[PDB]
Amino acid sequence: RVKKLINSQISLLIGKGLHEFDSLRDPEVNDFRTKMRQFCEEAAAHRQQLGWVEWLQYSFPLQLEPSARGNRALLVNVKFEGSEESFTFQVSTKDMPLALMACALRKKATVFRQPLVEQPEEYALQVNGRHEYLYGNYPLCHFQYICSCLHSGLTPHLTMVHSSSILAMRDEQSNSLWSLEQPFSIELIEGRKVNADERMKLVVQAGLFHGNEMLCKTVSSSEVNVCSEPVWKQRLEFDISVCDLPRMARLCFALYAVVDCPIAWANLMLFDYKDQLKTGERCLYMWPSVLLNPAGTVRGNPNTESAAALVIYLPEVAPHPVYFPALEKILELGRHGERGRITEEEQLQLREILERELYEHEKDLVWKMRHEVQEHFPEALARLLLVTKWNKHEDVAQMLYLLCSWPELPVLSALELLDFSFPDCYVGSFAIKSLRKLTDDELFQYLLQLVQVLKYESYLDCELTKFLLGRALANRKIGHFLFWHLRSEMHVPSVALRFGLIMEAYCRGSTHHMKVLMKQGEALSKLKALNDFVKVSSQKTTKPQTKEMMHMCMRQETYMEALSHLQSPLDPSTLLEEVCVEQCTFMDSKMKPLWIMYSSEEAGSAGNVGIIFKNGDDLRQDMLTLQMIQLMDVLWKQEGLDLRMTPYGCLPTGDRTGLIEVVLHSDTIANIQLNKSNMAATAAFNKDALLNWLKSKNPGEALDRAIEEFTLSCAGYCVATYVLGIGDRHSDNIMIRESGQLFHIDFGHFLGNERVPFILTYDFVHVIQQGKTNNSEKFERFRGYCERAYTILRRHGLLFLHLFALMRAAGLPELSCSKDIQYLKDSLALGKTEEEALKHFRVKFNEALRESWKTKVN
Numbered sequence: 134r135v136k137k138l139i140n141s142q143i144s145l146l147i148g149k150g151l152h153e154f155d156s157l158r159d160p161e162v163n164d165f166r167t168k169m170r171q172f173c174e175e176a177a178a179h180r181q182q183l184g185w186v187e188w189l190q191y192s193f194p195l196q197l198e199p200s201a202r203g204n205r206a207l208l209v210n211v212k213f214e215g216s217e218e219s220f221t222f223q224v225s226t227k228d229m230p231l232a233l234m235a236c237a238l239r240k241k242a243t244v245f246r247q248p249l250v251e252q253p254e255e256y257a258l259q260v261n262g263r264h265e266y267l268y269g270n271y272p273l274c275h276f277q278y279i280c281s282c283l284h285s286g287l288t289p290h291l292t293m294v295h296s297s298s299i300l301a302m303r304d305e306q307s308n309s310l311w312s313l314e315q316p317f318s319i320e321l322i323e324g325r326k327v328n329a330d331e332r333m334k335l336v337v338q339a340g341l342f343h344g345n346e347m348l349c350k351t352v353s354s355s356e357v358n359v360c361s362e363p364v365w366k367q368r369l370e371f372d373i374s375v376c377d378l379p380r381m382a383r384l385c386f387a388l389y390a391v392v393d394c395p396i397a398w399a400n401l402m403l404f405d406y407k408d409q410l411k412t413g414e415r416c417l418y419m420w421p422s423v424l425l426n427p428a429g430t431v432r433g434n435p436n437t438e439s440a441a442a443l444v445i446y447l448p449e450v451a452p453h454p455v456y457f458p459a460l461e462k463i464l465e466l467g468r469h470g471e472r473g474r475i476t477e478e479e480q481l482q483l484r485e486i487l488e489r490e491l492y493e494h495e496k497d498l499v500w501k502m503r504h505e506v507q508e509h510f511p512e513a514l515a516r517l518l519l520v521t522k523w524n525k526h527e528d529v530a531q532m533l534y535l536l537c538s539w540p541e542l543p544v545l546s547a548l549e550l551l552d553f554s555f556p557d558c559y560v561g562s563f564a565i566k567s568l569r570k571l572t573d574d575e576l577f578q579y580l581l582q583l584v585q586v587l588k589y590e591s592y593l594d595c596e597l598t599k600f601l602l603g604r605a606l607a608n609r610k611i612g613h614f615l616f617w618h619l620r621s622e623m624h625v626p627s628v629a630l631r632f633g634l635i636m637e638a639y640c641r642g643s644t645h646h647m648k649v650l651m652k653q654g655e656a657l658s659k660l661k662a663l664n665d666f667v668k669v670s671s672q673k674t675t676k677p678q679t680k681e682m683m684h685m686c687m688r689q690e691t692y693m694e695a696l697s698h699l700q701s702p703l704d705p706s707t708l709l710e711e712v713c714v715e716q717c718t719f720m721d722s723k724m725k726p727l728w729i730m731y732s733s734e735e736a737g738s739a740g741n742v743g744i745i746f747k748n749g750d751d752l753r754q755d756m757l758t759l760q761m762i763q764l765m766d767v768l769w770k771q772e773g774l775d776l777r778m779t780p781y782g783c784l785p786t787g788d789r790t791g792l793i794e795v796v797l798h799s800d801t802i803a804n805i806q807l808n809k810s811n812m813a814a815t816a817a818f819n820k821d822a823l824l825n826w827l828k829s830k831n832p833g834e835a836l837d838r839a840i841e842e843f844t845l846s847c848a849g850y851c852v853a854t855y856v857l858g859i860g861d862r863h864s865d866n867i868m869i870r871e872s873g874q875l876f877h878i879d880f881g882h883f884l885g886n887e888r889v890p891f892i893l894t895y896d897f898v899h900v901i902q903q904g905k906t907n908n909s910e911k912f913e914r915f916r917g918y919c920e921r922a923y924t925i926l927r928r929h930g931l932l933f934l935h936l937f938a939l940m941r942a943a944g945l946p947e948l949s950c951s952k953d954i955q956y957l958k959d960s961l962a963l964g965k966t967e968e969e970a971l972k973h974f975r976v977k978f979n980e981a982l983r984e985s986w987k988t989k990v991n
């Protein structure tokens with residue numbers, strides 16, 4: 134009964150019935166399902182037996198300040214679970230949670246006149262009405278929650294949770310090739326269901342690829358007249374022996390009409406998932422184009438009824454099955470050869486290119502010196518993997534002999550190896566091996582890219598999937614975001630099977646978390662139906678009329694139940710308790726997004742949270758932009774610079790659907806600049822508006838801190854939008870917080886899409902200068918923040934480039950070519966010394982001040 138129940142709940146949550154994986158009768162899907170179910174159920178068993186602190190590390194992973202992972206006194210209100218009563222203690226920032234625990238326990242002993250059996254060690258500190266905890270040996274200032282409280286001046290509210298109450302949570306949450314010298318060849322039989330102009334002819338272009346690099350030149354078929362069912366029945370002979378074909382070789386096709394006109398493409402892996410070379414007839418269910426697409430999926434289009442179908446024939450090269458030689462035979466072949474006997478002058482020339490795109494002779498020097506590359510320049514592995522002739526088996530074996538004895542490389546170097554430019558399974562396997570040392574916070578930071586890399590994968594059962602599942606089942610937040618990255622792409626036919634299969638495997642490993650996520654999905658189901666109603670309604674009547682009707686709809690028990698008592702998909706730590714129907718509304722833009730507010734008596738002031746549900750637009754690019762700004766913030770803070778950034782949440786959840794985090798106490802620059810009457814912010818000059826509003830919100834001494842907050846966030850956003858090429862910036866997509874904090878919203882365009890200049894808006898220069906026409910003391914202190922922030926990002930120039938290259942797998946239109954990646958290389962001026970790039974930045978900063986000074990004049 135329960136086995137049947139779990140499957141039906143998995144089918145509903147993943148957004149595809151489990152029976153549909155079975156109907157494929159594909160042994161690759163069936164072997165993935167049994168192997169990963171077993172792998173996931175082991176993690177489940179390991180977890181259900183963890184210690185109580187180890188359970189806190191899984192369920193409530195520490196949220197530490199970027200400064201700690203690698204005095205000033207304060208009031209903290211502490212209480213005990215089974216009591217409404219609480220005590221406020223004066224503590225220090227330098228103090229550990231345990232000192233506060235033993236403190237909380239002394240006052241409870243005096244209040245109850247009993248010398249308490251318990252020790253501070255037995256308890257943990259929960260943030261009031263949040264799935265957040267404060268434990269480990271870290272001062273209060275090192276926790277993201279205490280640090281936050283110190284800037285908004287607020288008192289931290291904590292609850293003492295006993296070890297027995299945590300274990301209660303743990304318990305309630307239970308579950309031979311190299312002797313085939315003949316040239317490679319296929320028989321292109323015919324084409325099916327093709328749709329093209331009857332005037333033209335159909336040509337099939339096939340190509341053999343090892344990622345982006347061609348194994349041999351391309352070949353085109355004979356020009357056969359346009360008709361629905363074209364016929365060829367001709368041999369295609371490639372310029373490569375069947376002995377020379379690498380394990381990860383993909384045969385690519387491109388059907389196209391000509392008098393050029395793309396129609397469809399399709400790719401397949403020449404070797405199956407059991408290392409066996411493929412034989413027999415092959416029907417290719419084609420994907421529609423807009424010619425050769427090597428990066429595209431190697432699985433056929435699921436829509437067999439409408440899609441084009443080319444019939445090929447991989448012939449029997451031998452009378453018995455042929456497998457790719459095992460590692461033991463590979464390492465034995467590559468074990469033989471001559472080392473690099475190079476003179477001091479060529480060793481200097483080698484050091485020049487290995488520390489530096491290179492000429493043909495320069496690739497010959499890397500290859501000869503492949504042992505000195507391994508020995509003295511191991512971090513130059515990727516450059517050596519690029520010089521390898523992946524169309525020669527002896528060359529691949531010599532290379533794969535060095536890779537098996539290659540020392541582990543840093544996380545930075547491992548991320549580059551994950552690229553499609555490195556298609557070898559042993560190279561990919563080596564990348565995950567060097568990525569294991571990634572901490573949970575770093576893995577969280579790069580989890581979006583690692584999920585997109587799943588789209589480059591040639592087979593279902595892979596190291597990257599087992600790695601992502603392993604880390605996801607060891608950490609409930611990683612698991613949370615892994616699920617939503619997969620769930621949000623189920624509508625895309627090319628990944629739906631892969632992604633469907635990963636979530637099922639996850640769900641097997643966490644039955645309780647599937648139930649938690651089903652609750653998020655039920656809430657998002659209601660929000661879609663309500664948002665649709667608002668779209669239709671706003672077209673038929675006034676905003677108060679639609680708002681009231683949204684409120685009536687929300688007040689239905691079905692809605693009240695589905696929309697309340699959940700974990701936020703934006704942040705699993707945030708609990709969305711009682712839905713505040715009176716505060717819910719909708720935005721007046723094209724997609725009419727929903728503004729949903731929540732309150733929690735258990736969480737108090739911190740439990741006033743809201744989420745925005747937006748349906749109609751792809752939100753993935755916003756998310757990427759936001760994650761990139763957040764990374765900058767993390768990087769700046771690791772160098773001691775806090776630019777008071779607002780890296781608010783944005784998470785795609787489904788088809789052109791997702792969530793945006795509400796920042797309360799903020800309004801857009803435009804709304805403030807409206808300069809309305811009978812308000813505190815009303816101005817004598819419109820340039821006074823932002824400043825007047827910062828004054829109204831910040832009385833007395835407080836105003837100076839708001840001007841500083843503005844200056845810091847501004848400098849951070851001026852740099853963030855310049856490096857990322859964020860354009861279409863106006864007063865409607867620029868916001869200000871009551872604390873003085875400036876931040877940007879709605880990122881529709883990045884990376885030029887051409888050559889976006891640095892912008893200094895005189896409205897924000899007027900606040901920086903404290904309303905003074907000239908204030909060089911304050912203006913140049915802001916230029917210093919821009920510079921420092923700019924020169925810190927350049928030091929991690931290789932990281933953003935490594936991350937943005939991986940994001941090319943996402944299929945975002947503004948991230949589709951090397952022109953987009955080049956944009957970042959120019960914005961960070963990576964091909965320059967720190968001096969040159971700085972002088973250049975100043976040229977562009979002064980170019981922006983001259984442009985700002987246009988308004989200043991009037």
Ligand SMILES: COc1ncc(-c2cc(-c3ncc(CN4C[C@@H](C)O[C@@H](C)C4)o3)c3cn[nH]c3c2)cc1NS(C)(=O)=O
Pocket residue numbers: 718719720722723724726728745747752755781793794795796797799800801878879880
């Ligand atoms: C990807 O697109 C977006 N990305 C972000 C936001 C957005 C937009 C806002 C926002 N825009 C205006 C206001 C302030 N208003 C909100 C209104 C409900 O109540 C007023 C008191 C102040 O807040 C916001 C506030 N916190 N978080 C926010 C996020 C909106 C959108 N979509 S859009 C431009 O609304 O179509």
